């Protein structure tokens with residue numbers, strides 16, 4: 414196990430920054446992920462034979478959709494890497510192990526549809542899981558892959574440490590349900606502003622890990638404008654697809670998902686920066702000061718969307 418992964422100089426440098434884009438070379442993304450684990454965790458955390466076999470089974474069970482794809486998984490894992498590297502001593506060995514795997518797995522077997530469209534379609538998964546429908550499925554898919562012959566990357570953990578990591582991964586994945594983020598951020602807001610926030614309180618850590626997961630999940634709004642803008646097309650390609658499918662069930666969908674209402678996208682993006690993205694990275698910056706560069710980048714991209722509306726581009 415004296416085999417390190419190395420990246421070219423430019424990647425080796427930019428991968429440490431929050432705004433890093435992992436590039437269009439699909440075949441470099443596994444090595445980028447392993448590189449991040451080795452540096453975040455240790456070269457010993459995982460048996461490389463098993464990690465590599467886990468990664469490629471995880472890749473396979475992500476679909477060919479415009480946004481909720483294998484690129485998203487690795488992109489979300491890189492944001493978590495940057496958060497963990499910039500907050501060295503606040504996280505247990507198990508939490509670093511668990512959260513990078515949770516980020517890679519967080520959207521397993523996503524089809525490009527919201528929990529809402531599964532409910533109105535009456536998809537079988539909506540009957541199996543009444544809330545956080547896709548997220549419970551994503552955690553299901555994660556456990557399934559972990560139990561394949563030769564895929565159990567945690568094998569060398571004790572029974573209770575193994576229970577702790579699957580529990581970290583379950584809550585981390587469930588927290589990527591944006592419906593739950595509002596209450597979670599509201600509670601974290603009050604806890605930090607009445608001084609009751611306490612990182613030795615497990616139920617507090619849980620909330621703070623959940624906010625990190627939302628932050629990593631939304632990290633496209635924290636990239637340089639050209640990456641943010643080009644990722645928005647992919648996000649809206651899924652939204653408009655779901656809108657089309659709503660119209661096939663005989664329901665006018667929200668404007669956000671109606672491809673006849675593209676003109677409304679810039680204003681809809683302001684709503685999302687102001688209601689979701691800026692509050693998210695604000696509370697995270699208050700709790701984890703060194704994640705400020707995510708808040709600053711998000712503010713720069715809000716400004717870029719205001720300029721789009723003003724016709725300046």
Ligand SMILES: COc1cccc(NC(=O)Nc2ccc3nc(C)c(C)nc3c2)c1
Pocket residue numbers: 591630631632633634645648685688689
């Ligand atoms: C009540 O129903 C609500 C309320 C608040 C938010 C939501 N959900 C909601 O708006 N989802 C969006 C929209 C635009 C987005 N734009 C970008 C670039 C990214 C990364 N994520 C987005 C997520 C639903």
Ligand SMILES: [Mg+2]
Pocket residue numbers: 519520547589590
């Ligand atoms: Mg998701």
Ligand SMILES: [Zn+2]
Pocket residue numbers: 485489519520589630
């Ligand atoms: Zn996601």
